[PDB]
Amino acid sequence: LSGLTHKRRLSALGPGGLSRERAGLEVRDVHPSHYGRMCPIETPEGPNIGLIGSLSVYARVNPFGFIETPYRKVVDGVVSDEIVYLTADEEDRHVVAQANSPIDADGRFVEPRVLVRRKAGEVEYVPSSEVDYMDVSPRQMVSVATAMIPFLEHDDANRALMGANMQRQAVPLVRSEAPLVGTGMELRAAIDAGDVVVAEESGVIEEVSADYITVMHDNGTRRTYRMRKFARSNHGTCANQCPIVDAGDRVEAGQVIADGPCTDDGEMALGKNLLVAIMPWEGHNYEDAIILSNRLVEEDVLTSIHIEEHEIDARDTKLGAEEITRDIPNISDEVLADLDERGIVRIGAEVRDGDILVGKVTPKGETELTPEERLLRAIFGEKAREVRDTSLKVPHGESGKVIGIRVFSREDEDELPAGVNELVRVYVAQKRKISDGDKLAGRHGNKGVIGKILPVEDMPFLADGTPVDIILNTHGVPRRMNIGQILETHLGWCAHSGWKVDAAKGVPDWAARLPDELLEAQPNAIVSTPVFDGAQEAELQGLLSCTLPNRDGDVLVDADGKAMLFDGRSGEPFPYPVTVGYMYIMKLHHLVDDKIHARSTGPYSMITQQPLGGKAQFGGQRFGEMECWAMQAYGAAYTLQELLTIKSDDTVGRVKVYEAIVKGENIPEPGIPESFKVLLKELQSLCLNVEVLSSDGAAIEL
């Protein structure tokens, strides 16, 4: 979904276009001409809001570059099957109907007056004859991402925007499961995303294997589809393609053969179905936090696979040529027990933080050894070994197997950048299980963080002993005004438990409009509610009172949708019934592993001498100005003197304090920051005589 949406993006900035600062705020708003061309919901939440949209589902680009939309023209009040595409001006000069407007099976407008859209943001009832054009589907004004949010018509605009944006950050799990409740866009989005291999021509499968599949076409020609497996994606996630066909099966042309990441039987599946109980629970789910059952962790329900990637190169130098070798200067054999003869880690060898990943030696010039270092070299027979150590090592906070190694050598006639001879890249794969700090979110724009992972024995359990897999706070639902999540929960429970609408006496009143095939469902069935045209509230109210009983012969949820839970700790039933139902939960990519950051003392910059360093050794935080006003307001003065001089900029104070802490003595007095000496030395270079002075007026030395 993320790739499909990116290919479908509509940038409004960049070369040849507006810039953030220069552009006014009037261009970021919606216009009545965006209906059907540019989705008004989907948009980045950051500062780039309104400058980046997405093509509507049915929008098409005319040769001149203007976005067209479909319409079926009404000739004399009768809807015509044939459709025409109208641009902005043509739409303005005509009259456009509304898809939801009731229409008789013969195409006669039952309502003499029908809601209409006019030139610019004007909507008014018009006779059923003056109307000139009609839409195609109610989902014409939504993007692809927003078209797969069930009950979108009930959520607020901002909440829908957040949910649509978050649907593009889901992390493909190990075992994807199709949603119980979801619109009809899932399958088409999955098919057109290009991540599922689809048979080009109808045929019969001869033999199918995890690596590859061979299909015999009806014309006597055989074709083989190679499925990439455990291939690193562009953002660290893994891409897998597991076949979903069996030997001796005749596959029709265009049928999905294997499912890529986030796909279950050829339909998008970004997350799993979890049993949700909406209630506050001892404050662990307080203010958007989430409580998860340990069953998810121990069942690999939300287990994700991530593949890192490291690479080093041996570039020739004026002083010599760097070469990768197993031997490394002055290192114990135990550390180098995993490297092979070629000097690289063996495939499948677990690698921890700080471990050596590939050993290389770089040429050395001339540098007289320090007295004791030279003596130690002499004593032990360890020659100077001038060549230094620059072996690539696993950065801080990485672990896992070494799935694959790729090496390009100039000797083998391979294309390398000028000045390089040996380039090797090692892929490290890590399997991540959901833990505290990882972000979860549904399709309705309700984020959260795992506050706690309770044991399966502590979670509240239904009357039949089925512990709930997740608990969501109830104080965040009505305030944020995304009531669609509760309706999704109710429909999900109805779909999971299955329902059988009573029909011996006849179809009830509330079920008059239900499709004839939708009056009976099996347990764990699949249901869909297309955006802006789906199950009304009456339908859910009727369904909730007709759910099938469990295998034990009892019905858990009442007509209202609530159930009587049992406390996991106290053991006594809760005083009042609680809402329960299956809700579709995704796993966002804002994992806690990447966010954790710490730095006691590392490398420093060059011009400014401030703390700095690539995220391998981690960099210090940013003590801005507001963080300084907060300190001043406290009356705190020594902390502010420290945070800006002794641990930030002092070239000698930093060393002195590090020695003092590593020694028993006290912390010395801070000196003058280098950011002020630099300022003076630069202000002097402008031919401005800047000299600090005492009360006596005597110039001072710094």
Binding site: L4, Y58, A99, S137, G184, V251, E252, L518, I526
Partner: peptide
């Protein structure tokens, strides 16, 4: 009305029929 041959069967609460299928996304 699954356009693709081997789609999973998921009934829908659809009260209207779309005259045009979604074009190539």
């Amino acid at each position: 009305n699954n356009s693709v041959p081997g789609a999973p069967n998921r009934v829908s609460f659809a009260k209207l029929r779309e005259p045009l299928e979604v074009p190539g996304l």
